[PDB]
Write a protein that binds this ligand. Structure first.
Ligand code: ADP
Length: 325
């Protein structure tokens, strides 16, 4: 067996989600999203929100192995002249890709109630919606027309709803509060290290995945397929699960800037280059976002975690087949 064959087999038998399970899980999310729009509009009339919408690999057909999770973005409405955002590189935290949202001027904002010390706290905003999720046990049977049962998730996932749809099938939808100031999009997705957990996170995923799609659509290439394999590999072990979709996506994107030919027969070649690149970034302790180079996507990892990942992947260019096992 060529590495090529083993890669395609692994994708087919391990990475890929059955088209049925995949489409069905997506439709569950779509259905619930539409329901939560109507209901929460009446359940929280005072709260300045845009329409909520779905986001994540399940929505993008980049989810792997099993289809069980998706984000529901909750867009806060902010009066643009009552708030400004401060990029981390200009703060004392000095963390690019993470923002402060500072309260400004006069006026009143509904969201003043989540401001502490003159800043809109992502955690305080998150707590407003932990309340909403916990309150879901008071709601009527939403989606009961399409035989869905919505339940707050088992602790400690205080922002997650559990949706059971027939039968013994569950989809986990977490609320992801978001703010848009000018053209900067931020989400309350805590920095992995707690010190930075009250900084807002710059939303990079939509632009990352759009770039990935556009590149593959231009030439029917295999960038997405190679990515999905990596994502499923990194879901295989505890060690490798410290690697993220975003990190792997940007590994691919960087490699795409160097390699134009992503024909399906080049998959094994690209997979090794991807591993190679991944090892270099880990060696350097730096993986810059392809779309915003100022942002090091490895900056939520401790240097030891980074060294251990490097160790975990040390023999991968010469025993790659081992990752598929
Ligand atoms: N619009 C968005 N902006 C920023 N982050 C997002 C957005 N949608 C989802 N995310 C985040 O991206 C991560 C999931 O990325 P994803 O590609 O779904 O990886 P996986 O398939 O491994 O779950 C989650 O931590 C989630 O909070």
């Amino acid at each position: 067996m060529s590495l090529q064959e083993k890669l395609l087999t692994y994708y087919r038998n391990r990475a890929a989600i059955p088209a049925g399970e995949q489409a069905r899980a997506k439709q569950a999310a779509v259905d619930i999203c539409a329901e939560l729009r109507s209901f929460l509009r009446a359940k929280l009339p005072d709260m300045p929100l845009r329409d909520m919408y779905l986001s994540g690999s399940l929505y993008d057909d980049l989810q792997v192995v099993t289809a069980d999770h998706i984000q529901l973005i909750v867009p806060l409405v902010l009066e643009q002249n009552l708030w400004s955002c401060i990029p981390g590189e200009d703060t004392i935290m000095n963390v690019p890709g993470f923002f402060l949202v500072r309260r400004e001027n006069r006026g009143s904002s509904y969201w003043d109630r989540c401001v502490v010390g003159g800043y809109l706290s992502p955690k305080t905003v998150a707590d407003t919606f932990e309340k909403v999720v916990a309150g879901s046990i008071n709601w009527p049977a939403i989606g009961s027309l399409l035989d869905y049962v919505i339940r707050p998730a088992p602790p400690p996932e205080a922002l997650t709803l559990e949706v059971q749809y027939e039968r013994d099938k569950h989809l986990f939808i977490d609320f992801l509060p978001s703010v848009t100031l000018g053209d900067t999009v931020l989400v309350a997705k805590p920095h992995r290290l707690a010190q930075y957990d009250n900084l807002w996170r710059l939303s990079l995923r939509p632009a990352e995945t759009a770039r990935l799609r556009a590149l593959d659509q231009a030439d029917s290439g295999c960038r997405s397929l190679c990515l999905k394999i990596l994502k499923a590999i990194c879901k295989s072990t505890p060690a490798l699960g410290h690697l993220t979709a975003s990190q792997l996506t940007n590994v691919i994107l960087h490699l795409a800037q160097e390699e134009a030919d992503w024909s399906p027969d080049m998959l094994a070649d690209r997979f090794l280059q991807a591993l190679r690149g991944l090892i270099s970034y880990l060696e350097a302790g730096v993986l810059p976002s392809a779309l915003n180079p100022k942002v090091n996507l490895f900056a939520e990892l401790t240097p030891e975690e980074i060294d251990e990942l490097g160790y975990t992947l040390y023999c991968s260019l010469s025993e790659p087949e081992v990752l598929l096992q």
